[PDB]
């Protein structure tokens, strides 16, 4: 019982920690997506004119 409860509190700590990690990684992925798409659009529009 004590071993399985140690494994269970490890699982609870790991699940909450992976929840924090998923939130922070989603934030990083969102700012990365916005940066990628914005850089793409700036490439396209700035190369459009070429005056």
């Amino acid at each position: 019982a004590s071993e399985l409860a140690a494994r269970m509190t490890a699982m609870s700590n790991a699940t909450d920690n992976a929840n924090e990690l998923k939130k922070t990684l989603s934030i990083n992925y969102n700012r990365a997506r916005q940066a990628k798409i914005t850089g793409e659009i700036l490439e396209i529009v700035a190369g459009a004119n070429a005056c």
């Binding site: 934030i27 969102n30 700012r31 916005q34 940066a35 914005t38 659009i41 700036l42 700035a46």
Partner: protein
Amino acid sequence: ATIRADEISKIIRERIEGYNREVKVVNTGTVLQVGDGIARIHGLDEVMAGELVEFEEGTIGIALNLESNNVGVVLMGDGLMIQEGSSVKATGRIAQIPVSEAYLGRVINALAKPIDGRGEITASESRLIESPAPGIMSRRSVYEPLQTGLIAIDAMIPVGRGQRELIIGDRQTGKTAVATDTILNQQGQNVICVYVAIGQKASSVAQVVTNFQERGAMEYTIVVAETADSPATLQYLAPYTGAALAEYFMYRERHTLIIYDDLSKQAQAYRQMSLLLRRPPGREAYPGDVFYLHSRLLERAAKLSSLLGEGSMTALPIVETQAGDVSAYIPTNVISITDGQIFLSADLFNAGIRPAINVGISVSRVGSAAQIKAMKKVAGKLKLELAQFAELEAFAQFASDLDKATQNQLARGQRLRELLKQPQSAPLTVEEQVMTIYTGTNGYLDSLELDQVRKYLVELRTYVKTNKPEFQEIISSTKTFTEEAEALLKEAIQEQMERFLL
């Protein structure tokens, strides 16, 4: 440009009638291509770079970029009801604004026009928009404190008059309650505040100006308000005109407090105003000029030395971190532009702490130099206490422990952090917050409930001043928390512990 703007048929007729003939148009120009809020004008050669040109309907236009023929201006009003072929006229004043001490209480629409409607404010102009920021010799190190009112801010992240200090946060987590609390606490000591709201849904700024009106701060404050439904150039100009309208009172030897609201929305108005110009953008499509923008805006808010009169303007800009990411573009920009950061975290405000200030990230570069000689010792002790508690809570000791917290520091740290929460728009005076800081600092009150430390300290606050004006006099005259003040405060809080027990 192959399609040059000064090549309309009607306009080039005017030049083609006289090749090398009778003299040019001195101050009469025909508007043309008045589209994306950026009119262009033929002729008008008298215009100074930065001159303030006028139109027929009565709308005002800054003349930024005059090319070879077209003196391209940035019309400040809405460019809707202007038609092509209309005449314009400059007035020979370089982007001026009429400003006076009649503005205290009004609601300006960023063109020195009152938007409350109840009267037209008179003034002696004397003030430009893009004036030079005070020189390096004119400025003096920040020494006088600012009673921000919020316990957390004025305890650990001190704001000093003359020290710009952004309150960066997240959407729908304070920053306007925090800004209006700073303005509201400035009731007693005279400062000519300027609450310049850039990006605010008009109901929010109407609610804020009404809250000012009813709680009395309208005797001094100035709400330079610009709705979210306003032409982008007005949302761009409103903080500059707020800075000029507060700088008029800064130059004449009087402390001021300006608060730019939603300075990220201002940079958003500028990226709009520039991507309409099709000038090339940078990261997150900001045109790169946002730094020089927030430079002209935020470097003209600091304390002038005794030579020009000991005046001051704390700046308290509010950059709204829409992402929750401190490492976005414009929050990083304003953090580099300002003397510190007061981070209003989102998760804490969702968790309950009503001034969501977390002292882990929020630092003040002016530091303990700007605090009072009274509060400095106890606030240093409190900051170290919060460091200890933050470690002991964020980290281990959930199992009982070797060191066995909740019996050394965890209970008192929880009591302190739940003491740091203020009620909504109820600022604490200087002596009140000094005593409140002292209470949990040295560990006087540790065996109450952590549930209602606030609900005890409301009684303590109401009691201490009515019982012992000796404390208020000590803090008000000498400005130093004496050992005698410590003793009389001990006796006062003892008698209040009695009255609370019964």
